[PDB]
Design a protein around this ligand. Structure first.
Ligand SMILES: [Ca+2]
Ligand SMILES: [Ca+2]
Length: 293
DNA sequence: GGGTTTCCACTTATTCACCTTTTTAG
DNA sequence: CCTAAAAAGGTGAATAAGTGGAAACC
């Protein structure tokens, strides 16, 4: 099929990226050439998602990104109009909305060909200073007279379950937890999570009310921090999580892990997880999920 | 035809996904 | 006692984000 547009924006909120290149250049009149676009890089196993997007928007080029990943890149200027038309109708809701807004300001600058005149590049740099990781060291030297306005924090709520399915297609984990505990000796526990940096803590907190279950767990690694929304109560997983993605279909290989997750759920609901044979079946499903596929 | 646009190969750091065991709740 | 639910603990890598070089093109 071709990707539902709210799924697509949810996936883009999770995996997308806007780019603005401002390249030192001797062959350009202004001394710099530019390139603007939107891009997605995934593991090779989900090349299909990217092809589905390419054919859904009917723009963008696909290339390998190393030997284990592949990317969809859209920088052909005329084709950016399809990106904008899509994100005006179906807007992002994470902080990435801020990066989209800058992409859009840079689009105007180039639509008027202002990116050739010296003043035109000065505005692209001003814009670029607050996009993603901002200006390179080399760029701050070329333009130390730059002062750019502070960037508003985005705070937007989940628009609907389609957005959620696309976002969960990016950030979610459907997990079968096997706990030592032993007379049978293995408690089967389903876990659902969604992972996201603290910068979108508001959206992450809203998930408890949006889905009617779960809890936020704060996580750390070196100096970095982020958040998990987690559900571990079987009834909530069986009555609240599973129907949402049944009605609102995941994409990529992660749909297969969801489908296996649902097989284990059916077995827990039938108490087969408390029998030896059912336990064995669950181990086999777990074996071939996620990293084991 | 040559200044600019587009494309394609390729790289890098950390926010994701995914994993295990222990402890507490019921 | 027994089973479920949550907490405690951990990290490899698929992401986000970016770069070099050059052919395609107006
Ligand atoms: Ca993300
Ligand atoms: Ca993902």
């Amino acid at each position: 099929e071709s990707i539902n547009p709210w799924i697509l924006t949810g996936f883009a909120d999770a995996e997308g990226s806007f780019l603005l290149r401002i390249r030192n250049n001797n062959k350009s009149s202004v001394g710099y050439s530019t390139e603007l676009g939107f891009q997605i890089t995934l593991h090779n196993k989900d090349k299909s998602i990217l092809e589905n997007i390419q054919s859904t928007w009917k723009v963008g080029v696909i290339a390998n990104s190393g030997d284990n990943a592949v990317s969809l890149k859209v920088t052909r200027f005329e084709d950016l109009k399809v990106i904008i038309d899509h994100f005006e109708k179906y807007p992002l809701i994470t902080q990435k909305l801020g990066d989209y807004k800058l992409f859009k300001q840079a689009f105007s600058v180039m639509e008027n060909k202002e990116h050739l005149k010296e003043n035109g590049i000065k505005e692209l740099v001003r814009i670029k200073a607050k996009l993603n990781w901002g200006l390179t060291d080399e760029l701050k030297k070329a333009f130390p007279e730059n002062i750019s306005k502070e960037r508003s924090l985005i705070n937007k709520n989940i628009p609907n379950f389609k957005w959620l399915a696309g976002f969960t297609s990016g950030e979610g984990n459907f997990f079968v937890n096997l706990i030592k505990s032993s007379k049978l000796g293995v408690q089967v526990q389903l876990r659902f999570t969604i992972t996201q940096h603290i910068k979108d803590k508001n959206l992450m907190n809203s998930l408890i009310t949006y889905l009617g279950c779960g809890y936020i767990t704060e996580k750390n690694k070196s100096e970095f921090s982020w958040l998990d929304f987690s559900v571990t109560k079987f009834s909530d997983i069986n009555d609240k999580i599973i129907p949402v993605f049944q009605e609102n279909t995941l994409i990529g290989v992660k749909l297969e892990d969801f489908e296996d997750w649902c097989k284990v759920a059916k077995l827990i609901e039938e108490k087969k997880h408390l029998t030896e044979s059912g336990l064995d079946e669950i181990k086999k499903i777990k074996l071939n999920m996620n990293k084991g596929r």
